[PDB]
């Protein structure tokens, strides 16, 4: 792969059994292009790569006719108009911001039948004072609360939680991060107790 980030999204897509082939995708936080490369490899029709920070998209991805590169001030400004229409799959890997702040934008870019699969980073969700030594959320209970808070906000926007999967590679300084599968149209929405069980297994089962 172009980046080891590729392995994270493969892990998520395999765990949730989400197909990409033929679909229109948004990669929010595209940066090096790990996520974008995987989407293209799995048969995506079109990928919008929102460059929303430091890092350059690898030349080979930038020159692919299935890829549109957007260079926005941030992910929270994303709109259907800006990306050229709603998409079927949204993935997001964002640094030093809470997903609460961008979820309305991501939801607004998604079709009603889409999958939204953000990578939840407890170190960027918990309060200062709760982040442990070295900037690692060592406390599994706090990692669980982070994921639940993101799920709760998604649910307030009409997007239910269907599954949770620890990313197979840790993030900065060793933080464990977790993919959440969100859908607004599903026959498998987790209940409160169901999400608790799924989060508990994901946290106990690690990367």
């Amino acid at each position: 792969w172009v980046s080891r980030g590729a392995h994270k999204l493969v892990g998520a897509l395999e765990a949730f059994a989400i197909a990409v082939a033929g679909r229109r995708c948004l990669d929010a936080g595209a940066s090096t292009g790990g996520f974008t490369e995987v989407l293209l490899d799995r048969g995506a029709a079109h990928v919008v790569a929102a460059d929303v920070g430091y890092g350059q998209l690898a030349w080979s991805l930038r020159n692919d006719p299935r890829v549109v590169v957007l260079e926005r001030t941030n992910a929270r400004g994303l709109t259907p108009e800006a990306i050229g229409g709603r998409v079927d799959l949204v993935v997001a890997d964002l640094s030093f911001i809470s997903l609460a702040t961008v979820l309305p934008a991501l939801v607004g870019c998604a079709s009603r039948d889409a999958d939204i699969v953000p990578l939840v980073k407890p170190q960027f969700e918990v309060g200062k004072g709760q982040v442990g030594p070295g900037g690692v959320v060592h406390d599994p209970q706090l990692r669980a609360r982070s994921v639940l808070a993101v799920a709760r906000r998604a649910q307030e926007l009409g997007w239910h939680s269907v599954g949770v999967k620890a990313s197979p590679l840790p993030g900065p300084s060793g933080n464990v991060e977790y993919f959440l599968w969100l859908r607004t149209q599903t026959d498998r929405a987790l209940s409160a107790k169901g999400l608790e069980d799924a989060v508990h297994r994901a946290i106990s089962e690690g990367p």
Side-chain angles (χ1 to χ4, degrees), residues 4 22 24 35 55 79 99 102 128 170-171 175:
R4 62 194 293 280
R24 201 168 207 288
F35 281 24
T79 66
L99 281 165
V102 308
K128 40 159 144 82
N175 278 283

Side-chain angles (χ1 to χ4, degrees), residues 82-146:
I83 70 174
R86 289 167 177 281
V87 302
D88 307 298
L89 176 61
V90 177
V91 296
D93 176 31
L94 298 169
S95 311
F96 297 105
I97 54 166
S98 175
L99 281 165
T101 68
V102 308
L103 267 177
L106 300 179
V107 158
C109 291
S111 288
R112 301 306 307 278
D113 208 50
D115 302 291
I116 299 175
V117 184
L119 181 52
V120 178
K121 304 184 179 176
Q123 69 279 20
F124 304 144
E125 296 302 332
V126 304
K128 40 159 144 82
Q130 308 189 296
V131 180
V136 182
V137 186
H138 283 307
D139 184 356
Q141 305 295 291
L142 262 165
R143 293 213 288 286
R145 294 225 272 290
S146 291

Side-chain angles (χ1 to χ4, degrees), residues 2 9 17 29 34 42 63 74 91 93 95 102 107 147 154 160:
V2 162
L9 181 56
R42 298 183 161 233
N63 295 254
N74 47 49
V91 296
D93 176 31
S95 311
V102 308
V107 158
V147 179
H160 304 296

Side-chain angles (χ1 to χ4, degrees), residues 12-21 23 42 89 115-117 181 183:
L13 295 175
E14 290 291 312
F16 303 145
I18 298 166
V20 177
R23 299 176 94 197
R42 298 183 161 233
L89 176 61
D115 302 291
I116 299 175
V117 184
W181 180 16
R183 290 189 61 87

